[PDB]
Every structure is written in structure tokens, then in C-alpha cells.
Amino acid sequence: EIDLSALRDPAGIFELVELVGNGTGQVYKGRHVKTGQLAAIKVMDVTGDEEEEIKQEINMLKKYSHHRNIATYYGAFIKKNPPGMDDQLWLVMEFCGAGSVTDLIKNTKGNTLKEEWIAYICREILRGLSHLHQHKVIHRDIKGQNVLLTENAEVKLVDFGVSAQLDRTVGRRNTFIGTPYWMAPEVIACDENPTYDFKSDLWSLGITAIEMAEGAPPLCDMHPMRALFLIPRNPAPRLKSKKWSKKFQSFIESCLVKNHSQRPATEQLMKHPFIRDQPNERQVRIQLKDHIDRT
Amino acid sequence: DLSALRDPAGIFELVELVGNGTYGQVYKGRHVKTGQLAAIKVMDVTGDEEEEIKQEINMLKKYSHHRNIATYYGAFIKKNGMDDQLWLVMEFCGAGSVTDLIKNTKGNTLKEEWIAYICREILRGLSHLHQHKVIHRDIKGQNVLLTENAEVKLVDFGVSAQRNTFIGTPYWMAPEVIACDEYDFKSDLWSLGITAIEMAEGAPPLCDMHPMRALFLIPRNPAPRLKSKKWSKKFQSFIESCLVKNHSQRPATEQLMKHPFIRDQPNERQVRIQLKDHIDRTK
Ligand SMILES: Nc1ncc(Br)c2ccc(-c3ccnc(F)c3)nc12
Ligand SMILES: [Mg+2]
Numbered sequence A: 001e002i003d004l005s006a007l008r009d010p011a012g013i014f015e016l017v018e019l020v021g022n023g024t025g026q027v028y029k030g031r032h033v034k035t036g037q038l039a040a041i042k043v044m045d046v047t048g049d050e051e052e053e054i055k056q057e058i059n060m061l062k063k064y065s066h067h068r069n070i071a072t073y074y075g076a077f078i079k080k081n082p083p084g085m086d087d088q089l090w091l092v093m094e095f096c097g098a099g100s101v102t103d104l105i106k107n108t109k110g111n112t113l114k115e116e117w118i119a120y121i122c123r124e125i126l127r128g129l130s131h132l133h134q135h136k137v138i139h140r141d142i143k144g145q146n147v148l149l150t151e152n153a154e155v156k157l158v159d160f161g162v163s164a165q166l167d168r169t170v171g172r173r174n175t176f177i178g179t180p181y182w183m184a185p186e187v188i189a190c191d192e193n194p195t196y197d198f199k200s201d202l203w204s205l206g207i208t209a210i211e212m213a214e215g216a217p218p219l220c221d222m223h224p225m226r227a228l229f230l231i232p233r234n235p236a237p238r239l240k241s242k243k244w245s246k247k248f249q250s251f252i253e254s255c256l257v258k259n260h261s262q263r264p265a266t267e268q269l270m271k272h273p274f275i276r277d278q279p280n281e282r283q284v285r286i287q288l289k290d291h292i293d294r295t
Numbered sequence B: 001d002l003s004a005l006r007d008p009a010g011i012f013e014l015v016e017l018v019g020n021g022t023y024g025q026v027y028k029g030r031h032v033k034t035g036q037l038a039a040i041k042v043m044d045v046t047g048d049e050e051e052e053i054k055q056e057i058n059m060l061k062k063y064s065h066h067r068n069i070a071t072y073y074g075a076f077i078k079k080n081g082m083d084d085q086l087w088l089v090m091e092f093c094g095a096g097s098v099t100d101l102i103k104n105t106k107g108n109t110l111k112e113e114w115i116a117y118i119c120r121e122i123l124r125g126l127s128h129l130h131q132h133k134v135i136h137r138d139i140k141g142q143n144v145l146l147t148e149n150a151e152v153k154l155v156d157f158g159v160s161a162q163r164n165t166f167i168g169t170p171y172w173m174a175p176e177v178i179a180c181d182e183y184d185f186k187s188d189l190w191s192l193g194i195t196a197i198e199m200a201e202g203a204p205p206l207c208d209m210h211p212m213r214a215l216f217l218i219p220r221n222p223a224p225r226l227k228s229k230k231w232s233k234k235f236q237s238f239i240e241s242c243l244v245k246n247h248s249q250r251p252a253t254e255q256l257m258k259h260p261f262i263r264d265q266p267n268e269r270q271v272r273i274q275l276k277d278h279i280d281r282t283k
Helices: A051-064 A101-106 A115-134 A199-214 A224-233 A246-255 A266-271 A281-292 B050-063 B098-103 B112-131 B187-201 B211-220 B233-242 B253-258 B268-282
Strands: A014-022 A026-032 A038-045 A073-079 A088-094 A147-149 A155-157 B012-020 B025-031 B037-044 B072-078 B085-091 B144-146 B152-154
Touching: A014 A038, A051 A073, A051 A088, A073 B211, A101 A147, A101 A199, A115 A155, A115 A199, A115 A246, A115 A266, A115 A281, A199 A246, A199 A266, B012 B037, B050 B072, B050 B085, B098 B144, B098 B187, B098 B268, B112 B152, B112 B187, B112 B233, B112 B253, B112 B268, B187 B233, B187 B253
Parallel strands: none
Antiparallel strands: A014 A026, A026 A038, A038 A088, A073 A088, A147 A155, B012 B025, B025 B037, B037 B085, B072 B085, B144 B152
16 A cells, blocks of 8 residues: 655655646646756645545556556655645656647647557557556546657556556456546446456547547537447447548457457457558657647 | 956857857867867856856866866856856867767667777776765766867766765766765766666666656666677676665775776777777768
8 A cells, every 4th residue: 555644745856837737636747856857746635535546546656657658657745734725745747748649639730640640649558558457457548638748759648547456367347437438338337237347448549549530539529428328329439531541440440349348358459450560660759749849 | 266267358269069068058169379179168157056166167177187087278257238157168079978979870889899998097087086085976978078089088077076965967877866855986986887888778778768767767676787698798797896776885996997897908009099990980
């Protein structure tokens, strides 16, 4: 376990620079005092309600953020406040300068990405998830908003706030948590009594590949509740355009299989030609970096 | 006394910008009358950096007269809306840094013979400072320079000591120098091991990760080693001796100089010529 009372005040160690946005708590552009090196700082208030969730996120971050496709944990701190205010805990991690995949799409003519970039980005997500799954971890919130880009267009995964730490390799879970539009049919276990696994993350990856392809996830136009209803009943989504590759159309086809038993595992999905057969990982990264930079 | 320093107007002149340093720029300079080349470090005078400016000019005047340390020629102050800028004039090291030489080299690796030669000169230079109660605190390929005749010179006394203050370059920092949560001459010897790996692999260990994830990893991870098995058993041993996370057990400068990778090294003239030939081939 972790002891929160053992965490020091961030005083002259780190400092907040500007507010980036909000999360599951706020997210700040922060800096390491002595070095001037940037970090993202997740400022969240200490409550006995969120305590069970706060503990898991710090645990997940300390253990697996070492992999290159996961935004790395730098440490945690607790800013102690007067009797008026709540104590706020800071999660310090790798600052991903370019922002989210979701933002990149928004700030792009047509709100679509070049297939080469989708293949590059998807691979990095798959590498990152393979790390997690091999370590008996389900992310449970894979979406473009949680797939970040550094200044050098490197792909990093974020938000362990809804993650799962399975015990056995044959272990299952049945909590029902995530973002409606990106949730897997099985994870919609709000009406059944029994179970899902690492496969759930692979569905969300297919939804995010569609998000990068179409600008938004399938069923974007409906209320999250309508989507929750439709996702199980409607057939597995596909790219509306015929201009995308046969490899991409196949990748989506493999990713989005409503029956998780028949849906391919992380290791086999990594073998897929859309992921495996890809050009100079360095050339695409640079091409993407060049696109990130504009107005 | 800083106010006793003359204006460099007509004495020395800046020719072109070589690069940048510790909150100050470095230019290729020229003595007006003689046409002779010098390194001029141009930095703004402030009462904040005053404590740091004073130490750099002090060490420069006291220890630069050694052969492995780029020699101090003098200081000047441009009197100026604008801030007064101080110029620190030293010997011009024509061939540039070890870091640059690596960058402008196919494979970004140096011949082991050159690494042994270069390392020895750094050790000679550090032995000088450590015997004189001085910690460099910023030993890196960018601060190890080469003259036209491929001679090795040390630079930047801006973070030096006469300790625990936490200053340097993340990758090169010694575990003990990472005293960022409330260290001696040995700290420089770690950085030398990192720079030997830099000359061997093109970059320091943990280069693939942000300086922050490196700051985190350096204490926790085991001491780095050369990833290739093609390097000598002597080189592999030298790195092994240099990089000992426990500074108490890490060998001193005098004993590290005794090491066979440094000591058992041939014609200091043949290697310097070989290196000179490589410097000249690249440009
Ligand atoms: N590390 C980063 N760097 C830059 C930016 Br912009 C980030 C935005 C959001 C997040 C983030 C991290 C953890 N949990 C979340 F829900 C969001 N991280 C950022
Ligand atoms: Mg000299």
C-alpha cells in the first residue's frame, strides 16, 4: 500500500505555472524549481470519499508509468491547508506539450488525421496497453482525451483513475466504469450479474481509431444514455468512408467485435498488418511533429 | 574588484556566436591588434548573479594556468536602459566540444583509443582541481573542449565549488548530488563515467527519457554500463569503477588515475595526431 501522510509539501520542489484544464481534480502546467523542467501536476482535494480512488491511481502510476508509451510519474506531494480549506494532493508526471489526440483532431482541417499518423498513434497505444495487460492491468478509459502527445510527437497514455489491478492472469472484473461512447459492449454490465478483461481496452482503441478517422466516436450525436442503450444492440461500428485502406478497415473489423470471446487479444492485435507493416517510425513521428506545429 | 575592469572596446571584439552557457553566451573572439583568437563569455551584471560571477572569475584566475584547463586571459566590462555586460576572455579551443565531435561522426561513437586519451586528460585536469580543493560540478562532453592540435581543455566554472547544493546537468549528475530532498570531489568522477559512455554511445545513459524521469531513475536504477560487448575489458572495468552509486566505496581521483584503461595507454602523441586527423576530416 501507500501512506498519504508520508508525502511532503511541494514547497520549493515543484511549482504550478498555468492551468491546463480539468480531470477526474485539476491539471496544471507545472515546473521543477531548481531545473526549470516542465511537469503536469494533477491537483486534487483530499477527501475520504475519493481516498479509495486516489490510492489506486498513485499505485498504478508508481508501478507502470516507466514504459515509454505511459506519461511517467515523478512523485506525489500534499499541500497542507488552513482549517478553512481542504488539503490538496499533487500527482507530478511527465508534461506532454502538444496536448491530446482529441485536441489535434479539433485543430485540424477536416477533423481527420492522415492514415499514416493513425497507424503510428494506434501502435504506440497498443505498445502501452500491451505493457499494462502483461502486468494484469485494465485501463478502462481509453479515449483520444487520454492519449497525449509530447513536443516531439511521442504518444503517452494518461489517467489511471478508473484502472483495474487484476490478481490472476485468468482474472476478470465487472465494475462498469468509463466513457459511454468508448465503452465495450461487455463493460456495459449494468443489467447483468456476471465479467470482462483486458479485451475491453481493445474495443476503446477501435473507437479512438474511428475518432481519429472521423473527428468523433460512433454515436456522438446521441445522449450518453442513448449510446449506452445502442452500443450492445447495434452492430459493431465501421469507418463510413471507403477511401481508408483495406488494412485500416480490417484493423477496425478486428478491434470492434461485440463478442469479446471471439475478439483478438493484445499480442495478436499487435501482429495485425495495419500496426506491424508500417513505415519509418521516425519519419511519421517527424511528419506528425511538423503538423502539430502551425498557428 | 569588478569596477576596476576596463571596457573591451578596441581591445577584443566578438566575431561569431559559438554557442551558449550558464545564463551567458559564448562567442568566437578576436584580439583586435594581434588578430589572435579567444573565447569570450558575454554575461549581464546583476546583483543576483554577482555571488556566482565573482567565483567563476576567481577559479578562472587561480587554476586555469594548468594544461587541461582552458586558460583565463582576462575580464572586461561593457558599460551601458541596458544592463552592464561582463566578458570573460579565455583560450580559444578551435576544434569545439567532445559532444560536437560525437555529433559530427558516423555512428556517433569514438575509437576507444580516443576515449582513453580524452578521459586521461579530463582526469589530469580534475586531479589538478581536486588537489586544489575544487569540485567542477558540471563535467559533460559539452564542457570538454578540443584545440586545433586535438588537446583536451576543461571549461565553465560557473557552478564550481571551494558540500550539498544540487547543481549540474541531470544525465551527468551523481546519485549523491541528487540531494533535492533535505557530496564531495567524487561527484565529478561519476560525470566522467557518464561522459565516457557519452563518447562510447553518442549520448549519456537514460537519454531516451526526460531529464525529470532520469532525475528519478539515477538513484533507484543500478549504475550504468556500456551496452556493447565489443569494447575492451579495461574500458568495461573503467566504467565499473567510475559509476559506483555509493560514493564512499567509489574510488578517489588519484586511484582512478592508476586504472589500467588510463595508465596503460600508448603514444600520447600518436593518438592526439590520430584524433587531430579525425577532427580535420569531419570539417
Ligand atoms: N501529463 C500531461 N502533460 C500535458 C498535458 Br496538456 C496533460 C493533460 C492531461 C493530463 C492528465 C494526466 C492524468 N490524468 C488525467 F486525467 C489527465 N496529463 C497531461
Ligand atoms: Mg591554459
